[PDB]
Amino acid sequence: AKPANKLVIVTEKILLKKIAKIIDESGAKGYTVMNTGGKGSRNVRSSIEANIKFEILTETREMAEEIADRVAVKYFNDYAGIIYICSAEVLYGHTFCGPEGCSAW
Amino acid sequence: AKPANKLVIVTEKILLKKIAKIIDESGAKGYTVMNTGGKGSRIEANIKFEILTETREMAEEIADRVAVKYFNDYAGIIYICSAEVLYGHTFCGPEGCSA
Amino acid sequence: AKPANKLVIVTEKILLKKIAKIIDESGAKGYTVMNTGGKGSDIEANIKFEILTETREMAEEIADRVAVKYFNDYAGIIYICSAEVLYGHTFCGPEGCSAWS
Numbered sequence: 001a002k003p004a005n006k007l008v009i010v011t012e013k014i015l016l017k018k019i020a021k022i023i024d025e026s027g028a029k030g031y032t033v034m035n036t037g038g039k040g041s042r043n044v045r046s047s048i049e050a051n052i053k054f055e056i057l058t059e060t061r062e063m064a065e066e067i068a069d070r071v072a073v074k075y076f077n078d079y080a081g082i083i084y085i086c087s088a089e090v091l092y093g094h095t096f097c098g099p100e101g102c103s104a105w
Numbered sequence: 106a107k108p109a110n111k112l113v114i115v116t117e118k119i120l121l122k123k124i125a126k127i128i129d130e131s132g133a134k135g136y137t138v139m140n141t142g143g144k145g146s147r148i149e150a151n152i153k154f155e156i157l158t159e160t161r162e163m164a165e166e167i168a169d170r171v172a173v174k175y176f177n178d179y180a181g182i183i184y185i186c187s188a189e190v191l192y193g194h195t196f197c198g199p200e201g202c203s204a
Numbered sequence: 205a206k207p208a209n210k211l212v213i214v215t216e217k218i219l220l221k222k223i224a225k226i227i228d229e230s231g232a233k234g235y236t237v238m239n240t241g242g243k244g245s246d247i248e249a250n251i252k253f254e255i256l257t258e259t260r261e262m263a264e265e266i267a268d269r270v271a272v273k274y275f276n277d278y279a280g281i282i283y284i285c286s287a288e289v290l291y292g293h294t295f296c297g298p299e300g301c302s303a304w305s
């Protein structure tokens with residue numbers, strides 16, 4: 001198992017491409033994204049409502065925080081969105097763990 | 106980063122509004138919800154809620170109200186994960202999550 | 205609260221049944237599954253399973269069987285998170301997730 005940070009970004013659906021681009025530039029090895037609904041309290045939604053949730057597994061905490069900081073500064077003063085982070089362990093993932101595999105021992 | 110509990114409720118889709126109302130009455134600052142499928146032990150369409158709360162007791166209050174009120178008659182599972190919120194105006198206030 | 209491992213499998217949609225059968229053969233009490241997109245426009249459609257297991261070994265069994273069978277040929281990632289189950293009739297039994305003795 002290889003420790004990882006699962007960065008979750010839940011935001012407005014119109015930001016899908018803009019956020020993916022950031023994730024792609026970050027050096028993160030990939031992402032998962034899904035359609036969700038949400039209700040919030042920040043009261044910032046540009047114009048239950050339909051959102052998207054990204055999940056990005058990163059090798060380091062700093063990479064997760066650099067993504068988070070770049071998304072939030074660039075979009076979250078103007079669009080609704082929340083970003084949080086969970087601890088995970090990756091058991092299998094060719095890209096994430098490299099040809100060497102995620103170990104186990 | 107500000108510590109938080111991520112409460113997850115996976116249950117039958119017809120309970121959507123009822124469960125949202127409980128979440129809204131708990132003091133929680135919001136929720137995310139999605140359509141999912143599932144198999145349990147006696148694929149079918151259901152919903153998953155995710156609710157980030159400031160305290161554990163708020164998460165358990167939501168969980169306890171939902172389960173007592175609906176889980177005798179409807180399928181469902183409720184679990185909780187630890188998270189840290191990095192950005193969230195409502196959840197972390199004007200001062201930000203540097204908490 | 206009853207401790208649990210949440211096993212997450214994100215992989216190609218065509219493995220849905222093959223993976224459900226593995227989950228069912230593990231002893232796991234059930235699973236949640238959803239449609240997602242992923243990059244590893246160049247987003248692709250895939251599925252995500254979430255399986256709460258009683259023990260770590262059951263989670264790793266499911267993970268190992270899936271990966272060994274399918275991940276040479278199909279895209280996928282498998283990870284695990286810690287969870288505590290507060291309510292779940294099947295997962296926690298008739299005595300509930302807050303039993304004492």
Ligand SMILES: Nc1ncnc2c1ncn2[C@@H]1O[C@H](COP(=O)(O)OP(=O)(O)OP(=O)(O)O)[C@@H](O)[C@H]1O
Nearest residue numbers: 038039040041042043044045080081135136137157
């Ligand atoms: N405490 C929380 N728990 C879970 N999800 C949340 C929470 N707070 C916000 N969200 C998610 O983040 C999204 C954006 O909420 P936010 O408070 O940032 O802005 P908002 O304009 O109030 O959003 P919305 O228009 O949905 O209310 C929500 O729609 C929801 O899916």
Ligand SMILES: Nc1ncnc2c1ncn2[C@@H]1O[C@H](COP(=O)(O)OP(=O)(O)OP(=O)(O)O)[C@@H](O)[C@H]1O
Nearest residue numbers: 143144145146147180181234235236254255256294
């Ligand atoms: N061990 C588990 N891991 C992940 N999700 C689960 C698990 N057990 C149950 N679930 C989710 O909870 C839902 C409700 O299942 P539960 O066993 O409470 O009742 P059930 O009536 O047998 O459900 P179903 O109609 O799906 O068979 C399931 O569809 C599934 O999405």
Ligand SMILES: Nc1ncnc2c1ncn2[C@@H]1O[C@H](COP(=O)(O)OP(=O)(O)OP(=O)(O)O)[C@@H](O)[C@H]1O
Nearest residue numbers: 029030031032056057095242243244248279280281
């Ligand atoms: N670092 C990561 N964080 C979150 N999800 C990931 C990550 N890496 C991969 N995934 C998910 O796993 C799926 C499979 O990706 P993987 O890296 O196995 O292969 P790929 O062949 O590059 O996939 P794709 O066809 O999606 O480009 C991806 O579509 C994505 O949903």
Ligand code: NA
Nearest residue numbers: 040041042043
């Ligand atoms: Na709002």
Ligand code: NA
Nearest residue numbers: 030243244279
């Ligand atoms: Na790829």
